[PDB]
Design a binder for these strands. Sequence first.
DNA 1: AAAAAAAAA
Lengths: 302, 662, 443
Amino acid sequence: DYYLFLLRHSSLYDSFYYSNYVNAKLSLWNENGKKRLHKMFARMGIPLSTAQETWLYMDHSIKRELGIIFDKNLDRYGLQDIIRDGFVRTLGYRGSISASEFVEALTALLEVGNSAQKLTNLRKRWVSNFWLSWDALDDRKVELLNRGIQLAQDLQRAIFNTGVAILEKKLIKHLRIYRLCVLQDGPDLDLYRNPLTLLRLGNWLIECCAESEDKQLLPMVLASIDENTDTYLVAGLTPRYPRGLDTIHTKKPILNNFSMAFQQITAETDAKVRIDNFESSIIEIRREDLSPFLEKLTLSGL
Amino acid sequence: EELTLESLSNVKANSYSEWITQPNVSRTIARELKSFLLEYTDETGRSVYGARIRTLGEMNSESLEVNYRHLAESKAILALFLAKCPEEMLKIFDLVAMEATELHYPDYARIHSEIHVRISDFPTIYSLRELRESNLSSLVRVTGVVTRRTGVFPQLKYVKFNCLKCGSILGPFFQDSNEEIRISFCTNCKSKGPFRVNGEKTVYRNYQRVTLQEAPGTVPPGRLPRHREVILLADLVDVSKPGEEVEVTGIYKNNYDGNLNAKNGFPVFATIIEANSIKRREGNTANEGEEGLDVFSWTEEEEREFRKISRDRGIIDKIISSMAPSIYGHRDIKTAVACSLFGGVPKNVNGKHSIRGDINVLLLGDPGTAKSQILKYVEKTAHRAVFATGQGASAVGLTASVRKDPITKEWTLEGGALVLADKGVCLIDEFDKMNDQDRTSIHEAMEQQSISISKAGIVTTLQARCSIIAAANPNGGRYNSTLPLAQNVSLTEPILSRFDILCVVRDLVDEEADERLATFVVDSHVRSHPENLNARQRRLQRQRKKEEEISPIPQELLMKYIHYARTKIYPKLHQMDMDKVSRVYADLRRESISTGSFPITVRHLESILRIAESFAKMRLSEFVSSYDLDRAIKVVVDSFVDAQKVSVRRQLRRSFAIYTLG
Amino acid sequence: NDDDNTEIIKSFKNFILEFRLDSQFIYRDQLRNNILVKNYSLTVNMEHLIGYNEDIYKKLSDEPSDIIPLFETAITQVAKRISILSRAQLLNSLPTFQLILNSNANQIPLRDLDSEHVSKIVRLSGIIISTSVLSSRATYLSIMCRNCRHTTSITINNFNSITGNTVSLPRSCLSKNCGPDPYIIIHESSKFIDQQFLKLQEIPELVPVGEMPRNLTMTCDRYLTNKVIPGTRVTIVGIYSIYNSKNGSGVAIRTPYIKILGIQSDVETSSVTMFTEEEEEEFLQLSRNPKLYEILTNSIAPSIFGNEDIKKAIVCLLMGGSKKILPDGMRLRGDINVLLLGDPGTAKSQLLKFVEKVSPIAVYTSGKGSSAAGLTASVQRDPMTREFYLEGGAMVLADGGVVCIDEFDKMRDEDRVAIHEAMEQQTISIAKAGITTVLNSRT
DNA sequence: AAAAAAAAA
Ligand SMILES: Nc1ncnc2c1ncn2[C@@H]1O[C@H](COP(=O)(O)OP(=O)(O)OP(=O)(O)O)[C@@H](O)[C@H]1O
Ligand SMILES: Nc1ncnc2c1ncn2[C@@H]1O[C@H](COP(=O)(O)OP(=O)(O)OP(=O)(O)O)[C@@H](O)[C@H]1O
Ligand SMILES: [Mg+2]
Ligand SMILES: [Zn+2]
Ligand SMILES: [Zn+2]
């Protein structure tokens, strides 16, 4: 199997387009990335109109020869790390599924499904979504998995649409210690109230930043807005090494000091925060209180 | 075998056709052709055909364009062979092109098995009247007007037969799109008998034939046009459209016919033209800036230059100043025309709401103000341009019309003027003198962007994405500054409201403005005088020197820039001042009819937004900044202010100075 | 030759008899329910066929016209197996079963069809503009001779895969000294099915730049006929094949056409009640809502701001009145008319297109580009036989629905008087070229 | 032979 987004349920073109690793390696957010992708397809020999078809109806000959085509074409452009070995589950005549696709569907179904009062309502909706995802586990239900797959596709589209705008507007401010980015305004901001959706967006941004020529490993701070509450949901993210690296420079994973910094600043200043999430690196802060807090985080020992 | 180019100078056979196909010379031709399209360098020192091959691979198209003058300047003997005997040369050229394409893209044959090569522009040009017997079986270049198009049908390419008298399967045979395959003795058995096609193992092409007339601008006055038949093979289908003047490079051929001999009493032969390349020549008659089938297409380096020049400061000012470099003053008109021809983004909300994304411009003013010259320049500029005028256009002429086909004898639909203006501009002159019945038929065109016909049992709706630019003159021939706009023109509110930008040009008396204008006019007149390495490039650099003194950027580069900006970049509108624009709209709702006569509606709000989107498009940027909104609001408020009575213009000018503060 | 056909038929029979998910053999019960209601047809979902085995799908995609009759005879074999008792050994009035396919492949626009789609399965969408009158097709012909004078029977299928496909008459007799083809057709004791022709037009929003819409011809038979009415958006699954025209420019030309295998329609030909029980319950539940009026009023053009009484009038118009009849025969109108007469810029035209989209049957036309003869009834003549016949316009096309007319004032005075009777009595009368017909149009 | 659309008088 390959590091591809729903390969067996979407077209091969959409899979290559929305795959995060290929996005990072080929800079698909501008037009040169699309030109290089069309170069990829032309050199492999798959017709564009053929590659824009569903995997079920896509041609049997190239389905059989896909492995050899990849092995012979992907060496030039540095994508040879996409090939891996995965687990495939088949039960009856319903079809075949893979672990990566299953976990993507589960995560999407967790994300989307169905002051203090509205916070409680949001947490209750999250609990209900958890129950729905739990119920979807059994093999007797597949309308609760097709919906998850389509929701995963929609959420990945939305994340890509927001990330390209962030990258082109260059909102990533580079400080001396850590990078900072704040989503002040935009479309569909109401989706990012979910911590897992925010983490997905941050993971894509981290991959995009790591797949660059910069030689600085700095933590990234991401914030959002929910106008009904007038609060900033801030998440701290650790840097990541490129997936194509040896194990010698992997003595220990990068540690996360954001929770410690947050708790120290909260214990020394009277900020109107609410640190209650199980993930200690995700906090809720006030719009008026963010900026001084940030300054403190800048001036404190990390 | 002495496979040398100098050995091709002298012929040994009786003619070219039988000599080209000789095995010894064919391989020499192939190797020389390969060396040509693999080694030819451009003025910059790069293999242009390599970039052509890469672009062909990216677009997975079927045609590779080879410039004729490139082949003529180097290895001219091959050019002569191709010009005199095209059939025996194009096949070798196709084979070598396929090999060259496979060189860059191995296993490319899976996408397509064969490639068709195209000739850009032959040196000699003929008309339909100047056709003789000497120029047969050779390339011809004919301009004309497409009148009747047959359609799309498939044809056999590799024909095989199964003869059941002996169980003999004939090998694959060709077809020349105008002759039936006829075999006499049927292979080894050497006899004639029953046979069938057995078309389960065959390959198909598609063809389209069309009737070509003479251009009305080329025919001598008061005479009749000459008709010919044009045959289009694969990849040429539906490229040409009815009513669109075209220029076709093709091969002249003749064949036998029965009733032509029957009615004439002499062995006369019918003639048809097998097309090889098509170039559109509708509107834009200026055909000297650059060469190629399509002048609105760009290479990769031209795209890189576009991106490089799209990031400098004040590029909008340079673009505005580079439009009509021989017309003095009228900065507002230039800005309005640029914003109109760059256009906006059509909006679709949930598939159930539609918002128009094009800008209309109305020009009104005194005579001798170069409105017609600006309209002509716009026609020369846009990719699609249609020119109408005064009483010379009818209501059903601009709109699609209903006609009965004389052959099949039933009602059909004929494309109107506006349909040709789809994705383009429709230019109207003398807008005031056009009759009201011929004026009230474009409301859907300006607003709904759709044309609906319910005539003679035919119910269909036609799309029309056209931007209308109009010019007119006020009542009495001059503009009365001390009168409202309602008493200046005879138009009504429904037609006036649909124009996003309305400009008024006043001819006044000034001592130094007249002197400056006269100096500019005299300098222009003395500049365009016909009397002031290769001579062609010397003339081209003379043209560049002439043009650089009034144009900040070359015109053809601007042409491709316009095309690229209209093609790819789509602005996005997120961070705009809700309160500022809302209060500006509220203020324009104030005054207006409550104090004067100019009508203002919600359409002007969308007009401001479209102008802001256009200004974003100017910079090749995907997102609207604040400066674009400021410029759009400044333009709109200026256009609104300068159309009031001189009594209150100063008061409104000082009143509305708080929103366009800058 | 025959062994491969038997192997393929056996494979399809094994598929239909064996396909079960969980605890139900769906296709066998489908056959039972179809036979019990005299609907000798079966529907195959393509994904199930792909999942069961890939070789059969490959063979079907390679040569559809040859393969399909084998499947459609395996179906009738299985039906006779699982419906009729042998009784240790009759009517047997079961014809060849019709096969209907469904799929979820990528759509192909009409203008993108080229020489590479010959004899392939394709899926596309369009708009229906005209329906031909039904015709008869023979399936089992009784053939009689003249000189030797014996009896014979000919079995013919509807799939051709080629232009000819036709065995007209055998050469020589069946074994004295008869003619080349001394046969006739016994019309009695023969079996016939029904065929219909349709014209499809490209969807307006996918028309390329500066071009006109293109038409195409489709052919359907048996249960697929009489399903679609003019003016209905449809999705078609069929085969793109070519047929010669010896009667009819160029050399070796062949006019392409589409053979219909499956039709999907949004209206589903509902307009007697055919809705599902769950849908009926949902409709009753919605009608039980205490504030359905405000919910529907908000639903009319949500992107239009401010208008309320206009939206209420639109809802009342779309719902429609109640038709009545009287003992003496007088009719009473049952529709409501709304006229919008206001200043420019008040979004008058944006409501018309939304009302057209919502209504199941609606047409949108302008008062400028229209004519009195082009709306009610157009009298045409056939170029071949030279006979007068009546062709409907736009008002008759929207019978039983609504008609959207904008720019009502620009309409010619001569044209605007024809609608007077067409709305005051909902019946139009034509007296042209000796034709005296009273035509119905309710809208 | 008879109905229906278009431009000029
Ligand atoms: N700066 C200028 N402003 C106006 N006219 C100019 C200017 N420079 C040159 N001209 C000349 O003035 C003439 C204006 O053209 P033209 O007479 O068509 O104007 P117009 O008022 O638009 O005409 P009409 O409305 O009668 O068609 C042209 O011959 C043009 O060469
Ligand atoms: N109440 C409204 N809410 C939102 N948009 C509106 C409203 N009224 C007008 N508009 C906007 O006005 C624009 C033009 O509207 P439209 O063309 O439908 O008006 P109209 O009344 O039919 O005009 P006309 O009488 O000139 O044909 C559209 O873009 C539409 O969105
Ligand atoms: Mg309107
Ligand atoms: Zn023989
Ligand atoms: Zn006999």
